[PDB]
RNA sequence: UUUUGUAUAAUGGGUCAGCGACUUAUAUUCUGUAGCAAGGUUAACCGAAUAGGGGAGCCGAAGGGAAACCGAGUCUUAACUGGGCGUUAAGUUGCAGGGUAUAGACCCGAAACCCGGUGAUCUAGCCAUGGGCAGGUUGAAGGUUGGGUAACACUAACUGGAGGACCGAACCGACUAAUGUUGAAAAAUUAGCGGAUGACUUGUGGCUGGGGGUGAAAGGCCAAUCAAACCGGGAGAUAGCUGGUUCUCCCCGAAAGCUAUUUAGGUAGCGCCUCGUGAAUUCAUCUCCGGGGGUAGAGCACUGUUUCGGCAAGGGUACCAACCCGAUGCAAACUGCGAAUACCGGAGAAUGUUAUCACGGGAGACACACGGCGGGUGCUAACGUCCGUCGUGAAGAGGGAAACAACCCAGACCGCCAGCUAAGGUCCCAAAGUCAUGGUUAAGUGGGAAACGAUGUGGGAAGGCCCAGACAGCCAGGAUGUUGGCUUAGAAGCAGCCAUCAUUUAAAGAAAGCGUAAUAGCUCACUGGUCGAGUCGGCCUGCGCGGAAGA
RNA sequence: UGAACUCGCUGUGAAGAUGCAGUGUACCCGCGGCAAGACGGAAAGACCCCGUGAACCUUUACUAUAGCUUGACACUGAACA
RNA sequence: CUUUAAUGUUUGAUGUUCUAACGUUGACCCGUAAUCCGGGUUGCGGACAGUGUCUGGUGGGUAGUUUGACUGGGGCGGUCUCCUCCUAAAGAGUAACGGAGGAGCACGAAGGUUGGCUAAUCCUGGUCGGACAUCAGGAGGUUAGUGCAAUGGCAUAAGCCAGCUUGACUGCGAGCGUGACGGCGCGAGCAGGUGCGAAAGCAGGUCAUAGUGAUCCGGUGGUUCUGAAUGGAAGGGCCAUCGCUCAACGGAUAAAAGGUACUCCGGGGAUAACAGGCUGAUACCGCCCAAGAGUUCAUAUCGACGGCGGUGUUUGGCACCUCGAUGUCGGCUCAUCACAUCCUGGGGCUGAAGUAGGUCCCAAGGGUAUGGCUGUUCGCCAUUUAAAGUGGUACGCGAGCUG
RNA sequence: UGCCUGGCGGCCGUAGCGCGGUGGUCCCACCUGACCCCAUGCCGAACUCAGAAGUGAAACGCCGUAGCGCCGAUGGUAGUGUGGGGUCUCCCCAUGCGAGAGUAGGGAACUGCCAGGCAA
């Protein structure tokens, strides 16, 4: 006994995977191990639009029902892991900059702990300049410099 | 869970005795072969009996098994 | 008005007077009307102009295909004995009317969104400037005096003066109770409670202006209104939702059904409603003829199910049991059999305002309830829900049933002080037999209710004994061992193992009841005499009683 | 406040009767009190449901973006290793 | 030209130095009695910063939306298409969250034709082999088989085997069945060319019902059909075919999950919760045959195995009135009535010696408490009596009051 | 004209089975060989070729036998359409139709065409 609800859920997952791979770029398509026919179908889906694109995606999902998906899932998982790591690094940098702008000495100490080589004097000067810019409605030059410095420190650590 | 409904096949007898019919008309709609075609009566793939020529549909019992036969006479 | 359904105790109304609800324009379809007629017709514009010019323009008479293209033929295919669409009916301009779609297009009733402005004299916060917070209470630091230590600390006094400190006015907060909820006020008043030198309050002036301000940070307040203020515009927003739609008469007059729907109270198609045109003894009733069923009924050939008896594979031979055999059953999901209705076609006398079918215009409706008929479901309970058909009401008043649309008879054109009749009644209220014939009932049954019970009543089949006199009665009898062997404790007939014998005999059994420790004693089985006729145990029962007690 | 010549009981009735059928009682009209009912009056129920109705809020629901942010292009040049 | 080397040209990535662009809310002077602004000198960094367009990523902070339907209140649980059997009342068709089950395949053959053939269950004989393998004989007549769950049919076999082929072909299709419709199915027959068979004749798929998706759009082959001046091409039109668990399967978007007790609006007793009515499984009570208990002895008292009766005092179903408002459990004042009687009163039986008791009939004229436990109705405990009774009145009374 | 035979149809269990008898004058069947035609998942089994030497055992055609199987009335019964009644989850009244099974009985066949042998 196989539940038609489970079948529908599996179909939805397959269609989601098809849409994701279609959205993925040319380099991602090359990296993912797709057969020639599936690659041609994906390219046709990308070229077409409107309800035709959705029905081509439905065809992709129907083909994936029979074709193996584990390599495709692994490739998508690794690509998404890399993208999420990059996004998390960017979010951490943005949050650290925001804390530096808002609190002050606590954020400076956190930055020093994350990167011992970080210059306390430079960080203090940049934070004071950013506060002055905020007070005088000046361009966020200090904020941009802080972001660049944090990115450089992260790159050096990595 | 049980009791799922399905549209009926609308089987039965369409033409009865004493009624004139035209060529190609369907006489009886049956799933199996309840009635066997005879003279001027042809049987399709779906075990449906049709008239090959104008006439009045007639029913007779023939054969060793006494199976019911449908025949048409040009009257 | 709502609905299957109303006085219902579901909706609205106090009334009078006035005002108020399907209009209008653009294009389309159809009807009636007027003309012309294979032609009709003008728009704008000119016009001393509702005339006359203006044929610009539009519509059909020739259509098919997507088109090329072809042509009364065309499209499909190399093309058909082929098939779809054209020919044999004449179109057009105005008027009025029935619809269609656009415009708010029958009207009233919403929340809610955007745009442009107004407010911080009410209210929240902040800023600046002034005032007020009675009175009485213990007092921390510091200073001074005597004792005390080498010196401090400590001790007993004077000065000293801070409490989100204490009691307690004015004042402030509404924390609690009540007053009131159109109020005294669209949140105020009374009586307590809390603070009463502190983040206190207040007069005055300014700022914070609405996806925003403010909030010692409950969605509170922002001019009596705030989970998004007020004023004007979009905007008479939209609304599958509530409600109303106003004068009269006549004819016809259904449904709450099927398919479909982001669809269940909305709406599209068909049946059902109505008007017109064209069509065949077209259709209905009844008689006859030819029909296939698989329902009732019946049965178990087959499919399940069920009991008994037997051979019994297999299984662990006093022991469980498959495949089977004979009988009894059951089945909406079984039919070796099988109908009456139901339906199709043909023939026919007669009736039915063609009651039958095709097309066009407009509908309404798509919430149905009950009884009968065979049911699913529910408890073979429900004024419970869902199926196929007739009727009722919805859409039908009247008469009967006390009142009740679904129970019974019966379809209101109007009037008449007429008769008959259907159901239902005839003692009367309340109209009519206190009618007649042969019976049942002694209970207020009639005038709610069952398993069961019973010398109630009338009869039937009957059954046993009966003037060689029956049943029950009237003065009579039941005498002797049988205090028994037996479990001897006494059962002796009146508790049991036991025979169930025997004399007097018109007649008596080794025994049925009452009670004594057992005794004993009194009746009954049968028997003398009179009267004497009928006497006794059950079944069927129609009609009767109990079981039957609710405010 | 539809209009009232506005009694109780049994049963029915859109199912709790001042108004129906049967029955019993009751002179008509006023005033001081009680309050069983006329499902008293109040708010087009806050409770349950309907609406391809509205508004606020939440996000790993959908669609975009303020903001943040990577790089390229002009302001933006001169000397050389 | 592939492959290299010095000078001379285009420059790009990168580093340093400089300043003339650029900022200076750094300093000094003037317009100026001037913390604005502008102008002149210098220094500070300096082609960095930022600015304008695009682009990669993040982004309920903001703006516009969605979260379907059936459902014995709602959520959860189960379903949304097609096929078989009964309900489905002997034409067709006919519902339920009724009962039993399947399908979204597959076959270049399992299709067409020609020829030939006919199984289950058991008995007998026989090495493994034994009831059930395969071999010979015996009855059999569809119980076998007919690919897929089911139904009917299949002896001419629609079942099995063998020789050849793709008619599983192209262009049509009168005439009918089925649905409101889109639509789906049957279908003799006409033209061309084929397969089987010498032939009459059969073959336009599978013994027959599910194995499928309209429309828009796009992909491939063909077509001068058209291609907006001409000659082409691009783009379009038509014929053949492919693309959707669009499974919410007659499918509104290519694109959407939840709360609001801070909610509102227009309505529904079409639809709920307290009360009314119907109904009476359940609950209470009474009784019948009666095994048996009761020191023997059924009915002094209980009394299984079974059934029959009254009420609505709990649990049950409809929502038939009510959502344009019926204020839903307790306490107080007011109480009313029935007896299925706690006592008082009159009686029967008794395993009733007397007081004191056990059971039943009539009788409602009358009486029928206080405190702790919970909000409680009710019920338990302690104390007195004659008791400290059971029930209906919206589980009486909020048009009486405190919740 | 008929005792017979083989085939072609109607009717198809009154038509088919159990038992005995009956036939080789023609026809039918059995049978011999298959070298050749023909084919066996091996076989003259099945089918086919030339014969009929030999026979009527099996089958085949006919008769008797009722033992089955089968058909089958009449009446009754279940049921049921119509209009009603009742102690109305059921039954009854008037009317129309009318089962299944069983009984009496029938029953072990009839019929048209062609071709061949016998006597006529």
Distance (Å, rounded) from C-alpha B39 to C-alpha B53? 10
Determine, yes or no, domain membership for B2: no
DSSP state of B27: E
Q: Is residue B63 part of a domain?
A: yes
Residue B24 lies in a domain: yes
How far is C-alpha A114 from the geometric centre of its chain's CA atoms? Answer: 23
* Spatial distance from the CA of B15 to the C1' of C345 (Å): 9
Does residue B4 belong to any structural domain of this protein? Answer: no
Residues by CB within 7 Å of nucleic chain F, which ones?
A: B 60-64, 66
Closest residue by Cα to residue A60 from A99, A29, A86, A21? A21
Residue B34, domain member (yes or no): yes
3-state per-residue secondary structure call for B41-68? EEECCCCCEEECCCEEEEEEEECCCCEE
Is strand C in 7 Å reach of the CB of B73? Answer: no
Q: Decide if B6 is inside a domain.
A: no
CA distance B70 to B62: 10
- Tracing tokens 């046709």 back to the chain, one arrives at A44
Spanning CA of A142 to C1' of C424, the rounded length in angstroms is 110
Tell me if B1 is assigned to some domain: no
Domain that holds residue B54: 11-75
Q: Which residue is nearest to nucleotide C347 (CA to C1')?
A: B18
Q: Is residue B36 part of a domain?
A: yes
Number of structural domains found in chain B: 1
- PDB experimental method: cryo-EM
Structure's resolution in angstroms: 4.0
């Amino acid at each position: 006994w196989v539940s038609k609800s489970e079948i529908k859920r599996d179909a939805e997952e397959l269609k989601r995977l098809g849409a994701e791979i279609v959205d993925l770029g040319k380099n991602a398509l090359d990296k993912i191990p797709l057969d020639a026919d599936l690659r041609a179908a994906i390219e046709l889906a990308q070229r077409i639009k409107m309800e035709g694109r959705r029905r081509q995606l439905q065809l992709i999902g129907k083909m994936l029902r029979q074709r193996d998906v584990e390599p495709i899932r692994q490739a998508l998982d690794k690509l998404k892991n890399r993208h999420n790591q990059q996004v998390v690094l960017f979010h951490k940098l943005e949050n650290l900059r925001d804390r530096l702008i808002d609190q002050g000495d606590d954020a400076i100490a956190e930055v020093l702990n994350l990167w011992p080589d970080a210059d306390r004097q430079q960080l203090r000067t940049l934070i004071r300049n950013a506060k002055k810019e905020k007070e005088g409605n000046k361009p966020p030059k200090s904020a941009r410099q802080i972001f660049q410095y944090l990115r450089e420190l992260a790159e050096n650590e990595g | 869970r049980n009791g799922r409904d399905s549209e009926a096949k609308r089987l039965g007898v369409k033409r009865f005795g004493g009624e004139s019919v035209l060529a190609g008309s369907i006489i009886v709609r049956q799933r199996g072969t309840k009635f066997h075609a005879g003279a001027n009566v042809g049987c399709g793939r779906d075990h449906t009996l049709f008239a090959k020529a104008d006439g009045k549909v007639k029913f007779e019992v023939k054969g060793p098994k006494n199976r019911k036969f449908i025949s048409i006479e040009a009257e």
